[PDB]
Amino acid sequence: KPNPLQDANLCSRVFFWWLNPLFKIGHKRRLEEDDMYSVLPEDRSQHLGEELQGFWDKEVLRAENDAQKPSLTRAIIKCYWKSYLVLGIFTLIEESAKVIQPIFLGKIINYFENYDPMDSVALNTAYAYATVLTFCTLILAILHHLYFYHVQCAGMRLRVAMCHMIYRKALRLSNMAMGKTTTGQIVNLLSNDVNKFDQVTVFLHFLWAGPLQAIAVTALLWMEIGISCLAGMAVLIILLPLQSCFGKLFSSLRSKTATFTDARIRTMNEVITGIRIIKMYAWEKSFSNLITNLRKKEISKILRSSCLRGMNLASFFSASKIIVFVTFTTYVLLGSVITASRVFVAVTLYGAVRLTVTLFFPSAIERVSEAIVSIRRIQTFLLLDEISQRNRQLPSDGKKMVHVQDFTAFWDKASETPTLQGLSFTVRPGELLAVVGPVGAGKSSLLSAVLGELAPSHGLVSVHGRIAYVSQQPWVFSGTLRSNILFGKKYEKERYEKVIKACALKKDLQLLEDGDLTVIGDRGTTLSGGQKARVNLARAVYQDADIYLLDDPLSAVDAEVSRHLFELCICQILHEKITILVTHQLQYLKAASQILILKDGKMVQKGTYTEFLKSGIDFGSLLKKGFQAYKNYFRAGAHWIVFIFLILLNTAAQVAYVLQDWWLSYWANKQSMLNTEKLDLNWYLGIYSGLTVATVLFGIARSLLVFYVLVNSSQTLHNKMFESILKAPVLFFDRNPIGRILNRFSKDIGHLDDLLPLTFLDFIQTLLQVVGVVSVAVAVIPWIAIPLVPLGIIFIFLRRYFLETSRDVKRLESTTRSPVFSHLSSSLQGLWTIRAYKAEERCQELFDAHQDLHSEAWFLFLTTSRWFAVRLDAICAMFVIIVAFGSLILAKTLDAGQVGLALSYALTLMGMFQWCVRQSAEVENMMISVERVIEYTDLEKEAPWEYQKRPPPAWPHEGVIIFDNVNFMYSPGGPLVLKHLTALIKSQEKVGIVGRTGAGKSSLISALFRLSEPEGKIWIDKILTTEIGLHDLRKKMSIIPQEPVLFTGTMRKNLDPFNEHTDEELWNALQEVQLKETIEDLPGKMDTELAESGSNFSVGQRQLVCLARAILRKNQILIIDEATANVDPRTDELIQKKIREKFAHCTVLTIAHRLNTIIDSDKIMVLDSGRLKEYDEPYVLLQNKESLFYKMVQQLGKAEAAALTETAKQVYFKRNYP
């Protein structure tokens, strides 16, 4: 994929003209990784990394020779100074241009100030000055982008060199070093700590041309306006500390909010996850209250933080008005007088130095400080102790031979019992050596000793030859299955097919779409554990090394596959290979050439299978231990009248900003046409102060009102979204995962709250400033409205043309960034596997290739940005040239105040225009959050929680439940689950439900609670369910769900969220389940904060909590759902006995998956894939052998069948026949 930046001119690289084809292509279709351009050779990851590694190695040698610490920063500087110095040359030129062009502005205004319509020599010198002014604007506009590309390319090169060095290290960390750190701190110095180097360079040079300029400018001001410049400059210095009190107080109101935001998101997680239970109990008003309170407590702090950001923006807006006000107040008070060529040079010089001081210099400080933090971090990482290269081998006779003599070693050096005790054994080619022992005996430790991972404290190990290894856990990296198998080696058809047929992957390869060519993710999300183990073993076999080490391969696979692998792949193929095995299944031991027993890290006996048959010690004996989006966004915040007031207040802020400078223009023009007659200073300083105060007050009012209206819009959108997600039916929670639902209450509301009001105000602020600049120019020279129409069509077409490809190349550099992260993670997890084979100088090449495919789309992200910006600066510089020259061809009607004003405003357009365009794109970016929040704002709704026909309070009186021809389905158009159900449940009668798992067993509860309004009729005491609002149906039917949940809060909350009970009642109920005792020993009596669904409680304890809930609610209908699956028998019988002896007069429906619990149920529904088949007493059902109850019982066995039959008969006799 050849790169055109390699073949370009210099005129064609100043203008990024070499990038035109990409845009054309991106304009038609979408861009994918094939359109993208391969990187310049000086920019490949391996080249950069090797260079910086050379410098860092030489410098750590220098330090080790000099006996102190080595510095990474010193190596970075030594490698990159001879090329970050030339960038410094251009930034010196550019900053002197910024300080020079106000001087020629002065000289043009000074041509007007002394006009003579006949003198042509003066006009010619003024044209010369206009030409020099335009050369400065074309050095700041057109050449700053080939520079800035190189400034940013330097940082990309530094980040890529660091990523390479970090990986080269992380591929050789000694095990004791891999212990201290984690595989999270080795992706957190590469996902956020090396991303600093992209940013540092951008402003690095603003540490010596941020002070230097602020001296040059001050010296110039002293030449023009005199000592008064100090006044102005004083104010400008006070914007460095003050802007750093809006920073040590915004982070005090912003880290005080996350402690409410994160509580709210945790509660929303418990609301969304357990939504079936919340609905079924009718509790969502309680969670409404909890999240309403946490959100109100969070908006209070978002509202302080927004008032402070609004004040910060208003201060940055009216700073220039204050600087110039105080300068020319002291200038005119000390006896001087305002002329219009010193005024609009002082204004312009303040503009330049104020932009440097308040934005660039402090950014440079902060980013260099963070980059030094990150360089320290990587400094520490690149010095973790490393594995000694497996050194010179003892010269042997070439035998592929494994021996150990008197080995004894530790994983950590403080242990009491050594990890290994005096190990001394050997293995030859062809000998399928094995070891048998319990877990903790250390067969992993023995294999790690073989692989060099265990450092010998005493003795010796001799391993000679190529080795293949299979880890206890399968390890699959990023790639395809054949890529996994080859592991960098060249493919061979027959050698691959032999291993495939040996590994019985044929069924597994058929399971995937591409056969063997399907792409496997990280940890193998595309495969299963057995499949991953098979792929790893196939890789090991195909690698064809002298030694094989196999660990725990066949414990996690089935019978036939494991047998086939052991015999036809291990026993037969590898009978000509050195073998060492870790096994847990004794059935394979018969094939073992040798077997060793290891226990407490020590030898017991080694010998064949028959010899250990002779020893008489059993193995098992030892084995056992749009635009509607904008309209709907703004309409939430405030009525339309407030939007009209907001428009007026934006306009008055900007009009007053401009009328202050026009006042200095009018003051100057009125001073010049004078006479001694003196100019009335009270009047002029009065209106000048009035205009400065109006600028400041209207900027402050405008910012706070934009912020307030948009934060209130956020608050209204959240309240409406949340109250619409509490009422969405459970279908909406089935279709969408808990991740997607909660992602709009955390992220998107997180943009609406603290980032969309800020950005949307910064855009409006700078847009009105651009309109102020263009309006002063047009109002002075009205003909500028003709050139300015083709400069506003060209802008629109440019921006469409760009954003049609800047958006295809701002995902290409995100969809290609993550494979680097993933490769580092994967090569850390299976690092032992990687190093076991000598094949890591191919994993380095893989990391380079993954890091040359992201520093290939960062290249296009850097240069498409400059393509666009060169053209916006062409537009803006044509505006400045038209103003500066159209003002001299019209010199007869203009005068020095008008020209000064128009032209210093045009000069300030430089950079403002681009910031406005950037922010507009960023607003349109961040409005997707609003589209999504408004999309959950209008979900479907289930029936209302209340109806007109309220139920009588005593209902249900009895609990007589009637089913009249009920059809129930989860979704419209989906399969029916119940088909014309018809039944009568007489009061108090205990009824069981039986059938197949999903034969309609699970939908009786959903139909009875109207979790999906059903078709048919259901009556409770002659009241149809569909005629009463939900919370008057779900309140009156207590349920014991399959897996209970505890909600974060006091145990009094879990038993009475609505405070309908007295603490003595709760104590009584907790005593009924005998759990009262277990509670009054925790710190809080009942107010103990709990974990997520009672991790500090037992499943049986959770069931006790839910059964207490039911006893407390004491409604005369009760439903139990899949009582016990894995409950301990004590708790089993406890729950069961309480269920019967607490609910004597309560109608009960039980839905059980075992027949023991519901054998005594007075009646039993039987379901057949959604059909009511049998409904009668259990003994009557068991009489008929054709009855599905009898058929299902006979599945159980013979003894259990007879016992259950006896139980049914006894119950039948005791109940019906006294």
DSSP, residue by residue, 341-392:
HHHHHHHHHHHHHHHIIIIIHHHHHHHHHHHHHHHHHHHHHTTS-B-----P
Contact 978, 993 (CB under 8 A): no
Amino acid at 1079: I
Beta carbons within 10 angstroms of residue 1018's beta carbon? 21
Residue 1105: which H helix or E strand, with range?
helix 1099-1113
Query: What is the phi/psi pair of residue 182, to 5°?
Result: -135, 165
**CA 375 from centre of chain:** 24
d(CA 763, CA 769): 10
Q: Which residues contact 1068 (CB under 8 A, 6 or more apart)?
A: none
Instruction: Find out whether 999 is annotated in a ligand binding site.
Output: yes
User: What is the token pair recorded at 474?
Assistant: 């399968």
Neighbouring residues of 1: CB distance < 8 A, sequence distance ≥ 6: 34, 36, 37, 38
Q: How far apart are CA 739 and CA 269, in angstroms?
A: 9
Counting DSSP H helices and E strands in the chain, the numbers are 48, 20
Beta bridge partners of 994: 1166
Letter string b/e over residues 477-504, b meaning 16 or more CB atoms within 10 A of that residue's CB: bbbebbbbbbbeeeeeeeebeebbebbb
Tokens 């039987």 identify what position?
Answer: 1166
Beta partners for residue 578, in sequence order? 547
Distance between CA atoms of residues 740 and 482, nearest Å = 34
- Contact in structure between 1072 and 1138 (CB atoms under 8 Å): yes
User: ∠ CA 599-601-604 to the nearest 5 degrees?
Assistant: 50
Per the listing, tokens 């054998």 go with 1159
Question: Pairing relation of β-strands 1163-1167 and 990-994?
Answer: parallel
**Burial code of 621-639, b = ≥16 C-beta within 10 A, e = fewer?**
eeeeeeeeeeebbbebbbe
Rg of the chain, C-alpha, whole Å = 40
DSSP state of 777: H
CA dihedral for 1095, 1101, 1103, 1104, sign (positive or negative): negative
Contact 126, 110 (CB under 8 A): no
In terms of DSSP bridges, do strands 1038-1040 and 602-607 run parallel, antiparallel, or are they unpaired? Answer: unpaired
Backbone phi, then psi, for 1173, in 5-degree steps?
-95, -60
Report the SS3 class of residue 1034: coil
Q: Determine how many CB atoms are found less than 10 A away from the CB of residue 386.
A: 13
Crossing angle (nearest 10°) for helices 144-170 and 86-112: 160
Q: What is the DSSP-derived secondary structure letter of residue 531?
A: H
Q: Are 669 and 895 in contact (CB under 8 A)?
A: yes
Distance CA 1017, CA 1039 (A): 21
DSSP 715-760: HHHHHHHHHHHSSS-HHHHHHS-HHHHHTIIIIIHHHHHHTHHHHH
Give the CATH number, domain containing residue 577.
3.40.50.300
Residues 6+ apart with CB under 8 A from 1089: 1048, 1049, 1050
Q: Is residue 439 marked as binding?
A: yes
Please spell the DSSP secondary structure of 1061-1088, one letter per residue.
S-HHHHHHHHHHTT-HHHHTTSSSSS--
Query: What is the DSSP pairing of strand 990-994 with strand 1015-1020?
Result: unpaired
State in Å, rounded, how far the first CA of the chain is from the last one.
Answer: 93
Q: Which residue has the tokens 């619409």?
A: 724
* Contact present, 1167 and 1001 (Cβ < 8 Å): yes
- Let me know: does 987 contact 959? Beta carbons within 8 Å: yes
d(CA 1189, CA 1181): 6
DSSP string, 265-290: HHHHHHHHHTHHHHHHHT-HHHHHHH
Euclidean distance between CA atoms 826 and 843, whole angstroms = 11
Any binding-site annotation on 335?
A: no
Determine if residue 997 is labeled as part of a ligand binding site. Answer: yes
Contacts of 388 (CB under 8 A, 6+ apart): none
Which tokens go with 622?
């030892």
1039 sits in which H/E element: strand 1038-1040
996 known ligand binder: yes
**Residue (of 447, 453, 451, 465) closest to 545 by Cα position:** 465
Structure tokens at 368: 């260099």
Q: What secondary structure letter does DSSP report for 810?
A: T
CA-CA distance, 1218 to 1213, in Å (whole number)? 7
Three-class SS of residue 405? Answer: strand
* 3-state DSSP percent of the chain in helix, strand and coil, to 5: 60, 10, 30
Structure tokens at 768: 């009105």
H or E element, residue 25: helix 20-28
Quick one: which H or E segment has residue 1042?
A: none
Residue 442 labeled ligand binder: yes
Cis-peptide into 429, omega within 30 deg: no
Q: Which of 258, 251, 256 is nearest to 750 (CA)?
A: 258
C-alpha closest to that of 76 among 159, 147, 152: 159
Q: Is 1000 annotated as a binding residue?
A: yes
CA distances from 848 to 160, 724, 823, 824 (A): 9, 49, 10, 11
Cα–Cα distance, 163 to 378 (Å, whole number) = 10
The label of the residue with tokens 């312009």 reads: 348
Residue 377 amino acid letter:
R
The verdict on whether residue 998 carries a ligand-binding annotation is yes
Domain assignment of residue 504, given as a range: 401-622
Residue 1129 in tokens: 């028998």
- Residue 729: asked if its preceding bond is cis (omega within 30°), the reply is no
Please name which of 562, 543, 432, 547 lies closest in space to residue 495, comparing C-alpha atoms: 543
Strand-by-strand arrangement of the 402-408 sheet: 426-427, 402-408, 458-463
Q: How far apart are CA 94 and CA 896, in angstroms?
A: 28
Q: Which residues contact 169 (CB under 8 A, 6 or more apart)?
A: 381, 382, 384, 386
Provide the residue type at 147 as one letter.
Y
Q: Which pairing describes strands 961-968 and 1015-1020: parallel, antiparallel, or unpaired?
A: antiparallel
List residues bridging with 548 in a β-sheet.
468, 579
Please report, for residues 53, 166, 939, the alpha-carbon distance to residue 163 in angstroms, rounded to integers and kept in the order given. 11, 5, 46
Q: Is 1207 exposed, middle or buried (0-12, 13-18, 19+ CB in 10 A)?
A: middle
Q: Residue 858 to residues 78, 151, 643: CA-CA distances in angstroms?
A: 25, 14, 41
3-state secondary structure of 1159: coil
The CA distance from 962 to 1018, in Å, is 5
Task: Return d(Cα 420, Cα 410) in angstroms, integer.
Answer: 7
Beta-bridge mates of residue 404: 461
Query: What are the distances in angstroms from CA 126 to CA 106, 113, 120, 189?
Result: 11, 12, 10, 57
φ, ψ (nearest 5 deg) of residue 853: -110, -5
Q: How far apart are CA 385 and CA 172, in angstroms?
A: 9
Beta bridge partners of 519: 480
CA 284 to CA 1034: how far, in whole Å? 12
Which residue matches tokens 């010198």? 125
Cross-strand pairs, 550: 470, 581
For residue 993, the cross-strand partners are: 1151, 1165
Three-state SS at 44: coil
CA distance 1214 to 1218: 6
995 is in an annotated binding site: yes
Q: Which helix (H) or strand (E) holds 1147?
A: strand 1147-1151
